[PDB]
């Protein structure tokens, strides 16, 4: 129409006029035409027009004009041809500069237009990075308009995804603290969701990870684990899990831990899986977290989770590991050991020692049984579940393997050590000692005494020591030629090896 031949060209000329007064006027007019389809297409198809709009926007000093030109670009970004024209007109560098604007209407137009470019315009991410958009966006995270923040945070997510360089710049700009602040301050679901995704992306970066944890990320994300928004909850859980292997030294974790224990009961497999993984890492060598998890009913919840999981190892492995952690080295380890039995967990625990369980799971299960055996009340029931013959079978097969490396990321040396270690504790009970000896294991334990691995030597000497507390067994051990290899262990730097070995010798001769 007359749009292309007269309208657009006239307006684009007016936008370059010296008397900016006639400019603010042209700006207004163009903005209006952009609001209507017909004239919007005429505008986007005119490189001169688009250029005049960009130029004017980043040079004006008249707010009404800055807003109209930015709004114009905003309306154009809705279309493919518009996105390209802005891009080719050098609009990105201009828009980014507009993120320093004191006018809210201008910032909203600029950020949304950039968001559209980042989402659909090829080459946009590089252009924004080069214009220093990451630093500008992070600095804007102190604003309070939640829809504005939701767009800005999403821009950061798009820019940071799979781009280390960008993740480090966000880190250097104080991104972690700014994002965590948002998670603790606002309640707008869309903003919490977009912010959690930025945090998730950063949580896989070895540099951002510690920073997010130090900024209070663990606790902040934990505040939303019960939100009705499933997308929000899941993204928080994913970020939490990524960060969990580096937060075993944070405090004020009571609430997070309490909620995680509750999530173990979820019908959402991904929620339970993530919750088990996070709990397993947070109870790893942290007695306070161990204490709190047991306090809020974690043992029962974990046992139930293992029962429900069946053969699903993505759940049982971390859950069994959490249980292993929880039944060891802390004021409430003994009650935990008892609780596992009280909540009907012994049967399934022992069950996990058998196929289809894979090695990683078997390894964790043996470690758990070893801790459970520290509780005398678990001696008989563990025996009655057939744990001993299976532990012996695992031991014998693994040893034979080391004599003929990582099988599924597990060395058989570890299985030999673990099973012998569980038998060492189980041997505290007289009836278990009878089963153990009846499986003709003494000759094997004696051979393990020659193992070049100190930890294996310790548990081998250990189980023979327990077995030797019965006269008949001590005689049988001596009859197996244990004296020589034991004597050789007397000078070990390992107190356990030296003590157990000496004890067997005193018991054999007494």
């Amino acid at each position: 129409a007359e749009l292309a031949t007269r309208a657009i060209p006239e307006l684009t000329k007016l936008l370059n006029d010296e008397d900016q007064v006639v400019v603010n006027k042209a700006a207004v007019m163009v903005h209006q035409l952009s609001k209507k389809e017909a004239s919007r297409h005429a505008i986007m198809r005119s490189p001169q027009m688009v250029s005049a709009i960009v130029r004017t926007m980043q040079n004006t000093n008249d707010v009404e004009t800055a807003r109209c030109t930015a709004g114009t670009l905003h309306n154009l970004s809705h279309h493919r041809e518009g996105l390209l024209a802005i891009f080719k007109s050098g609009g990105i560098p201009a828009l980014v500069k507009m993120l320093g604007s004191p006018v809210d209407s201008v910032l909203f137009y600029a950020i949304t237009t950039l968001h559209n470019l980042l989402l659909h315009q090829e080459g946009a991410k590089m252009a924004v990075r080069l214009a220093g958009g990451l630093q500008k966006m992070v600095a804007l995270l102190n604003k309070t308009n939640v829809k504005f923040l939701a767009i800005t945070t999403d821009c950061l997510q798009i820019l940071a995804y799979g781009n280390q360089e960008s993740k480090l710049i966000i880190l250097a700009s104080g991104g972690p603290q700014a994002l965590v602040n948002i998670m603790r301050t606002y309640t707008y679901e869309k903003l919490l969701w977009t912010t959690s995704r930025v945090l998730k992306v950063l949580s896989v970066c070895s540099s951002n990870k510690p920073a997010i944890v130090e900024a209070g990320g663990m606790q902040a994300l934990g505040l939303h684990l019960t939100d009705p928004s499933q997308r929000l909850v899941q993204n928080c859980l994913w970020t939490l899990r990524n960060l969990s292997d580096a937060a075993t030294k944070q405090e004020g974790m009571e609430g997070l831990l309490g909620t995680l224990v509750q999530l173990l009961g979820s019908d959402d497999i991904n929620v339970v899986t993530c919750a088990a993984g996070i709990l397993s890492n947070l109870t790893c060598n942290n007695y306070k977290n161990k204490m709190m998890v047991c306090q809020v009913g974690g043992i029962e919840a974990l046992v139930r989770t293992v029962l429900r999981a069946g053969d699903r190892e993505d759940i049982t492995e971390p859950a069994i590991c959490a249980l292993r952690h929880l039944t060891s080295r802390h004021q409430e380890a003994e009650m935990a050991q008892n609780a596992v039995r009280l909540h009907y967990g012994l049967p399934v625990v022992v069950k996990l020692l058998h196929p289809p369980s894979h090695w990683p799971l078997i390894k964790a299960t043996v470690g758990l049984i070893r801790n459970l055996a520290l509780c005398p009340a678990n001696h008989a029931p563990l025996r009655e579940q057939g744990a001993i013959p299976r532990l012996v079978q695992l031991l014998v097969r693994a040893h034979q393997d080391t004599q003929r490396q990582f099988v599924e990321g597990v060395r058989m040396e570890e299985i030999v050590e673990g099973c012998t270690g569980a038998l060492h504790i189980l041997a505290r009970d007289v009836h278990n000692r009878i089963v153990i000896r009846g499986l003709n294991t003494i000759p094997l334990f004696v051979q393990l005494l020659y193992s070049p691995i100190e930890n294996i030597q310790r548990v081998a000497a250990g189980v023979l020591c327990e077995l030797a507390q019965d006269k008949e067994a001590a005689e049988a051990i001596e009859a197996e030629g244990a004296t020589a290899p034991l004597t050789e262990l007397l000078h070990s730097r390992n107190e356990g090896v030296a003590t157990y070995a000496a004890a067997v010798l005193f018991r054999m001769s007494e």
Binding site: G162, S244, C321, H325
Partner: peptide, 15 residues
């Protein structure tokens, strides 16, 4: 038998 860590790195969606 010390406590062990599980290393996760979900940047998008586990699958």
């Amino acid at each position: 038998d010390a406590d062990t860590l599980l290393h996760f790195a979900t940047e998008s969606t586990p699958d």
